[model samples]
Target: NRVFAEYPDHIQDYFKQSFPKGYSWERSLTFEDGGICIARNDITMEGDTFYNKVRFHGVNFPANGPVMQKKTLKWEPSTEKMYVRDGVLTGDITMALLLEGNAHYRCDFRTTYKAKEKGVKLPGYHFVDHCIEILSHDKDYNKVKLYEHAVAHSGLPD
Candidate 1:
């Protein structure tokens, strides 16, 4: 009797439900939604290794009533893991991330689940596993400057 179990309709209507081309939704489940799956995500504040975790800072999942009770899970960062699929992604490559409200999310997802709940259909909920590096002190200032410089300089005539 997990909250996720009662929220399949939300998962289906919200997140885009799909699995790796050869795989089906029935084979992929989320760790949080299901307390069973073994492919768990980790977070650490250490250096690079085949396995290193980082703490996920900022943002809060809503809980409680009027809308949903605000349950404050202990603040923890998520570690980055190299994800690959169908021989597509490989190597230690970093990605360009954006800051929406106050958190950074990963674009990559993993194919790490085993079973689907009976009589319920839900889309894969993507859990981001990294922290947003806020290098610039003035928020989007750096972005604006970089964009201006790029636009000022003539790109290769194509």
Candidate 2:
């Protein structure tokens, strides 16, 4: 449950500074599709690049008597889509892209995962993708008010 304990100094500090005191990811998260945890690995800081690992395990096939399942996730660096118009930023420009004036950002994370193990005669589920699109609140870049899991593509196959 100590997710931030393994993160790099800056990466860890980023969240610590952004979120207020007494903030817990598990308590704040609504997607209990199954138990999950996210943490940073290989503490080498990059500009906007990150390599976070997600370890998941929980009740799958409850009828099978709470089978212990396991899965490992390695997600790519985050891709940020900042609010800009009047200036063609990305290739996939749309109507809203022309509206402009929204000083928020959208971060995309494309993750690939594979089934690990079905603990001792148990079963687990597979996914199409494990993608996440986190959108920011009304604030600056890293020091934003809040960034929520707005979209869950579930990303490309492992």
Candidate 3:
């Protein structure tokens, strides 16, 4: 009961019926310029539990020079959903962070999830893990280029 409290009634019921055991998803975005961000979310049955996290490493192309910075950013979901074979997660997440000033870009984002057969394999890995391919896109930006070819992977395998 406490776990389900984190989500709305519809989401709670959706999880109870769809992911009786547990579920997780991740979204990774890379810009054509030189920025990258990754976000991961999970909902476990231990108690209708839920969590989302984001990390960003980016470069700001200013006239001075190229500066690199890495850190975490605030993320909030406006709308999110999941299903047995597919999932669509949408939100307003911050990105294009700066290295010298208080300048970050905000944009509407969406991640598409699909059921996959196996997880990605590492060059020197051993065990197989759950896998799901996720496609993420940046939309309705105020000061950033629209990105259409962005994708990521959830560290889960079927």
lDDT of each: 0.25, 0.24, 0.33
Off by over 4 Å in 3: 1-5, 10-13, 16-20, 31-33, 37-67, 71-100, 106-109, 113-158
Q: Cα RMSDs of all predictions?
A: 19.0, 21.5, 14.7
Candidate 3 residue-wise lDDT, 1-158, digit = tens: 11132333222232233344444455656543444456655544445444433344434433333333232132222222222322332222233423334554443333433212233211211111111222343442234432122222222361
Write candidate 1's Cα lDDT for 36-114 as tens digits: 2222323222233222232322223224311123222122333323223442221121332233344432323233322
Q: List the residue pairs that clash in candidate 2.
A: 129-154, 129-155, 130-154, 130-155, 131-155
Whose lDDT is greatest here? 3
What's model 2's overall lDDT? 0.24
Clashes of each: 16, 5, 5
lDDT of 2 by residue, 9-128 (tens): 222122223222211221111122332223222222245443443444333323422112212122222322222123211111111111123322222222211112212111122111
Task: Count clashing residue pairs in model 2.
Answer: 5
Better of 1 and 2 by TM-score: 1
